[PDB]
From a paper:
The surfaces of most bacteria and archaea are covered with a proteinaceous coat, the surface or S-layer, which is formed through the self-assembly of individual protein subunits into a regularly spaced, two-dimensional array. In C. difficile, the S-layer largely consists of a major S-layer protein, SlpA, which assembles into a paracrystalline array enveloping the cell. The major protein of the C. difficile S-layer, SlpA, is post-translationally cleaved into two S-layer proteins (SLPs): the high molecular weight (HMW) and low molecular weight (LMW), herein referred to as SLPH and SLPL, respectively. These subunits then form a complex (referred to as H/L) that is incorporated in the S-layer.
Conformational flexibility in the organisation of SlpA is further demonstrated by different arrangements observed in the structure of a truncated derivative of SlpA (SLPL/HID) and the H/L complex. Our models indicate the presence of a hinge, formed by the D1-LID linker. Analysis of the architecture and simulated motions (DynDom6D v1.0) in these models identified regions of D1-D2 and LID/HID as two dynamic domains, with the residues making up the linker between the D1 C-terminal β-strand (β17L) and the LID N-terminal β-strand (β18L) acting as an interdomain hinge. The calculated rotation angle of the centres of mass of the D1-D2 region relative to LID/HID of 166° suggests a high degree of flexibility of these regions, at least in the absence of the CWB2-containing SLPH core, with minimal effects on the fold of each individual domain. The fact that we observed this conformational flexibility in our protein crystal models, with no apparent effect on the fold of individual regions, suggests how the effector domains of other CWPs inserted in the functional S-layer can be accommodated by flexible rearrangement of D2. The strikingly different arrangements of the D1-D2 domains in SLPL, relative to the interacting domains observed in the H/L and SLPL/HID structures, are consistent with this proposed flexibility.
Author numbering:
A (entry chain A): 7 to 313
B (entry chain C): 11 to 37
The structure:
Amino acid sequence: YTVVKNDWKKAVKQLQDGLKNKTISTIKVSFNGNSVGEVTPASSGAKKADRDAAAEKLYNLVNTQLDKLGDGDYVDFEVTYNLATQIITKAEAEAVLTKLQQYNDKVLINSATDTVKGMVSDTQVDSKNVAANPLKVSDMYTIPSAITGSDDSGYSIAKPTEKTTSLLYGTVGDATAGKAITVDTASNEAFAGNGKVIDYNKSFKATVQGDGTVKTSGVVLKDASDMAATGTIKVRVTSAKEESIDVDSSSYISAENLAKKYVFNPKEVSEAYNAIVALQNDGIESDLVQLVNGKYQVIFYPEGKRL
Amino acid sequence: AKITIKANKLKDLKDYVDDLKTYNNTY
């Protein structure tokens, strides 16, 4: 992962957010490859104040160096991360609960009919299955009304409380009694971030089983990302050495090396050459040949990299 | 992004740009 100078603030912001949410355990900072400090929340980021202090320590360390970066200088961030230790804030947990509460009245199973299975009373009429009211999410689950946790350890939504129903699953007209409907205890879990999001396709869902009974899910999680859960990665902020090619200094990229790097517009370069020559020998001024701070200069926009 | 070549002397700027034009043209 490498980024140019103009976008350093949003790169550092990403690293600060990872320190705050416990996904980043340590950052090693280096200027031009020379180690310049390490940023590590004390006590494995147990307290919010220590994680915020780490994010501030990182910004103070780098913001001036990145703001005046040039000359080909660069800044490296060697970042050890763990996506699974992610914690979420009170506001983030509140937003997930708000969405989760919209599933409270949704229907899991419709009333049965003569030709489509569904909700059937446990008491029969004529020894025959009669339909019952639809089975709603709230009939099987009690979604929590509040979030739990702390600023230090993060916030979470408790697992929705499981319930039972005596209503059954069958068809109207059937002398055979309806089948049982039961929560799936392996498909109901709490949400605390931890690199997961709520899987809304699989959550709050009835699944007809091979033996004719029905299982229901509560909250089911999935990964928020495809990227690997753990690792150590190095984010680099670069500056362009060819931004200011000073022909009189001890370090400048040569014309040949510049031409290996970039393809140039032949008209743009030919016209710059002619203006330099005409100014040097004939005294003709040109806007292509700046004289500023004791140095003659010209400006080029490459057509692109050479590939 | 822009590239800025500069020199105290017009002759050194000319030599650099001349070289740049030559190498740009060999491709």
